[PDB]
Amino acid sequence: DCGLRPLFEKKSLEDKTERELLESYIIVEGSDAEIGMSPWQVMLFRKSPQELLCGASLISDRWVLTAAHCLLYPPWDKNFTENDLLVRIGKHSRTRYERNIEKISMLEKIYIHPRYNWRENLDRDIALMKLKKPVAFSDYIHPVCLPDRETAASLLQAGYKGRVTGWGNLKEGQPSVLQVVNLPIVERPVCKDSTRIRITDNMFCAGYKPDEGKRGDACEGDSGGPFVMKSPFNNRWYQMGIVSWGEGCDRDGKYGFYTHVFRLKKWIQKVIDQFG
């Protein structure tokens, strides 16, 4: 039942911008998300001091996916352990406690990709977090699907648009509610030529070109959040990427970079079946 939203696909209602994504299959400068628009959205919350840590996504009733750098990044003295964080699921408002809507879960264990490259370019920027207890699904809490080879091959194409969501900074201040922006996947050569950072096959970049007019990008605080696409074949939402890195936010000629979820699915599956 993954990728089918209770408030949209389940009742055959479409959100305001999913049509834009469909038409392409041939957070800075975003907008407020609709209620229940991203039911798999997860907020990584630091306990003390209480603050926004990162974004993340719900992939099952006990597993949450995020960016490895959200938990481990020596250059900025970041090395969080299970008890330093909490996961808040089903949220819309950034700062308020959404009583009777959001659910807060404690972390049982964190698993960071063994070959996550924090020293150089954040290659394989992915991590899994197992919750202590399963979270109850609801109209605002629902898992997103993970792509198989076919889905990745057909949707991960230059020009095809995905959707990024998060409570991160609005500019390179803070948003009142969850932000959303649809961005087109960019050709590999263009991504490469836009930066001096070495790009790997475990990454892809997205965003509009300077001559395209439209804008939008992820920013500080959005890390770990999902880059999703709605399959035109089975109408389910798939998480194709994880907000990973960028140079500035929404700069002309620059693009946000995302962890290529399918490329690392082997690892994801290995972790899940081995550890329950």
Binding site: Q50, L52, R96
Partner: peptide, 11 residues
């Protein structure tokens, strides 16, 4: 400016 969350989750 984060609203305080119930104690059960912080314990």
């Amino acid at each position: 400016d984060f609203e305080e969350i119930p104690e059960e989750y912080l314990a």
